[PDB]
């Protein structure tokens, strides 16, 4: 028989062996319809790198083993597509001459030469090498397609109306992660996803994506929205969803009550802090925040409001009108303080403080009149208020609820800036009223806007 047999295959760059002898090298002897596996004492397998960097597999029969007449001996082993084959079928690598039958990526050669060497004869034998004439071809598996979905949410979640400006499209890029030390290819595939008003979800797919790599996605930062990118598939079958969710805004409104002068301006301060307690800085709409502080100037031309557009989710806000802007007003607040998790409106109301006017009438000498005022909480007034008689402005001071004025016939004093919802009584002093019958109009009353009391002094 023939002896000193060896079978050799040189594998192309398009295939490779499996890890850890999973290739399961074996030589089967087939004769008369029976099959048996040569043992380790009958054959040895070696793997080597050739000088051109290819893997060469040899089955070396034990040297004195002779092939049985008419038996088929067949070397079997498994290979898998190399990265090169997976790249070529995704269209990421050009073929060169020799790579595949008719340069078709569905017909990559598995071998770059294969042959058998053997000897025959007793004594000084003869040695022959024959090349296999078959050049088999294979098709790697289909490349991937990778779905990508873009979803737009309003401030309070999916399907909720969006109010912010949106671009007309978003360019999405599939990033092929480098697995051999190099840099990620961040432009591996790209797609433009249409963006239309009130269409929340739109889908595209990257085509012919090479297997063998991990992938990620780049999607643009869109002003007014936060961006979340998820792989809703697996590592080996990625599928991506980008969610753009509109950021919340804080509107500060000013309301005037009982105030006929609409030309005033007011400064309203807003304090803005993060849950983490980093100082907040940035420009939000028209309103710049420095170190957690912003100041909004409201007037009629701006519709009595300012907007901090697209603040970070969960920002703590506290609204306060500046002290100088509160003079002459009772100032109340709605939604003064909170956490910004949806759009919020914070309202400052400036209710002009009421005044009390007292007129002296004489029918038929200065007359002394006492004014008692108790505040909204029922406590006697103490403080000094501007009072005007005939365009002379004087301070009028209340002590323990009481002030006194002096009026001539037909004079009016008007006392400004008194507390909202306080109660007044006026009473002419006994000495002033001697010789006169005294009558009153609106002797008592509630300071819930401008009031007028009249003291009437009728001789006798």
């Amino acid at each position: 028989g023939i002896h000193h047999v060896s079978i050799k295959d040189v594998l192309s760059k398009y295939v490779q062996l499996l890890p850890n002898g999973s290739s399961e090298f074996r030589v089967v002897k087939e004769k008369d319809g029976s099959s048996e596996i040569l043992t380790e004492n009958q054959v040895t397998f070696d793997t080597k790198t050739t000088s051109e960097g290819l893997v060469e597999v040899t089955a070396k029969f034990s040297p004195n083993y002779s092939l049985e007449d008419g038996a088929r001996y067949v070397l079997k082993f498994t290979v898998t597509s190399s990265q090169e084959a997976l790249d070529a079928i995704a269209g990421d690598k050009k073929l060169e001459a020799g790579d595949a039958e008719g340069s078709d990526v569905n017909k990559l050669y598995s071998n770059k030469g294969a042959s058998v060497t053997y000897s025959y004869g007793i004594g000084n034998s003869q040695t022959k090498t024959k090349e296999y004439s078959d050049n088999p071809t294979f098709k790697p598996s289909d490349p991937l397609t990778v779905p990508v979905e873009v979803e737009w949410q309003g401030v309070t979640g999916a399907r909720t109306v969006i109010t912010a400006d949106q671009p007309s499209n978003v360019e999405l890029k599939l990033v092929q992660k480098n697995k051999n030390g190099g840099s990620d290819n961040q432009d591996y595939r790209k797609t433009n996803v249409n963006v239309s008003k009130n269409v929340s979800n739109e889908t595209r797919n990257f085509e012919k994506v090479a297997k063998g790599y991990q992938y990620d996605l780049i999607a643009p930062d869109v002003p007014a929205f936060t961006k979340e990118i998820k792989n809703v598939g697996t590592e080996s079958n990625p599928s991506f969803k980008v969610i753009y969710k509109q950021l919340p805004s804080l509107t500060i409104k000013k309301v005037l009550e009982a105030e006929n002068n609409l030309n005033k301006e007011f400064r309203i301060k807003v304090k803005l802090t993060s849950p983490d307690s980093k100082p907040l800085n940035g420009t939000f709409g028209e309103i710049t925040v420095v170190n957690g502080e912003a100041e909004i100037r409201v007037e009629k031309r701006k519709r009595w409001r300012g907007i901090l557009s697209y603040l970070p989710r969960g920002t703590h806000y506290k609204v306060e009108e500046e002290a100088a802007s509160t003079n002459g007003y009772h100032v109340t607040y709605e939604n003064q303080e909170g956490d910004l998790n949806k759009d919020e409106t914070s309202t400052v109301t400036n209710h002009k403080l009421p005044s009390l006017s007292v007129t002296k009438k004489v029918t038929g000498k200065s007359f002394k009149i006492t004014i008692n005022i108790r505040d909204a909480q029922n406590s006697p007034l103490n403080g000094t208020y501007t009072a005007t008689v005939n365009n002379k402005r004087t301070p009028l001071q209340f002590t323990n609820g009481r002030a006194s004025i002096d009026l001539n016939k037909d004079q009016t004093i008007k006392i400004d800036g008194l507390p909202l919802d306080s109660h007044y009584t006026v009473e002419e002093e006994t000495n002033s009223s001697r010789g006169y019958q005294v009558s009153y109009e609106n002797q008592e009353g509630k300071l819930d806007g401008d009031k007028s009391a009249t003291v009437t002094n009728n001789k006798n």
Partner: peptide, 30 residues
């Protein structure tokens, strides 16, 4: 000298993507 015939094939392994079995044979007649 003995006559030898050589056949080489590659076959996809059914139900396993990207896996193929190579077969390199030799038969000898006296």
């Amino acid at each position: 000298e003995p006559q030898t015939t050589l056949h080489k094939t590659i076959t996809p392994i059914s139900g396993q993507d990207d896996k193929y079995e190579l077969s390199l044979d030799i038969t000898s007649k006296l």
